[PDB]
Design a protein around this ligand. Structure first.
Ligand SMILES: [Zn+2]
Length: 195
């Protein structure tokens, strides 16, 4: 099967938000609204904001999963390459095969779907701190888009779903991701090509 990538705000008005980091050659993570694409360096912090119009019920969670963007590759599970899955860089919670990790959250849970074999990481949906209008999840991508035997230059999408305590869908959003050495230059190049 293939996970749906249809944007759905749902009853709580769920949608993502991204910081405005710019395209300087030294930037480590940058988002392109024009391409709906996040460019980031290997294993660097990717701040993703979660916005809602109303507070979802206690027990609501937020899950992240990667899928290949090209339809001809969509049924293939996105996973770390033969090299990175063996580099012993786990934080003690994320399985070494998982591409997407959540930083600084001891309540993060990593799932290997018994049926689809797909990987995902899910955390409780946190309300904004006093003074804040949204909450942020910090993700890390653990392989380069170019990793041989892994993504192998194929673009991926990250699908973020807001789900209830049973895992039922409450909201969905998504964005393309390119993990590369110079996110700033690549974003500038791709936006120019689009222009
Ligand atoms: Zn890799």
């Amino acid at each position: 099967s293939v996970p749906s990538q249809k944007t759905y705000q749902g009853s709580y008005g769920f949608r993502l938000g991204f910081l405005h980091s710019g395209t300087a050659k030294s930037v480590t993570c940058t988002y392109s609204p024009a391409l709906n694409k996040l460019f980031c360096q290997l294993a660097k912090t990717c701040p993703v904001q979660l916005w809602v119009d109303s507070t979802p019920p206690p027990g609501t969670r937020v899950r992240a999963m990667a899928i290949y963007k090209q339809s001809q590759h969509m049924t293939e599970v996105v996973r770390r390459c033969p090299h990175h899955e063996r580099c012993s860089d786990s934080d003690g919670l994320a399985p070494p095969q998982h591409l997407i990790r959540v930083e600084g959250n001891l309540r993060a849970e990593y799932l290997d779907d018994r049926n689809t074999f797909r990987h995902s990481v899910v955390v409780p949906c946190e309300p904004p701190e006093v003074g804040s209008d949204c909450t942020t999840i910090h993700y890390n991508y653990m392989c380069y888009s170019s990793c041989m035997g892994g993504m192998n230059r194929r673009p991926i999408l990250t699908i973020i779903t807001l789900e209830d305590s049973s895992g039922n869908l409450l909201g969905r959003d998504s964005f393309e991701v390119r993990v590369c050495a110079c996110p700033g230059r690549d974003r500038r190049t791709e936006e120019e090509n689009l222009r």
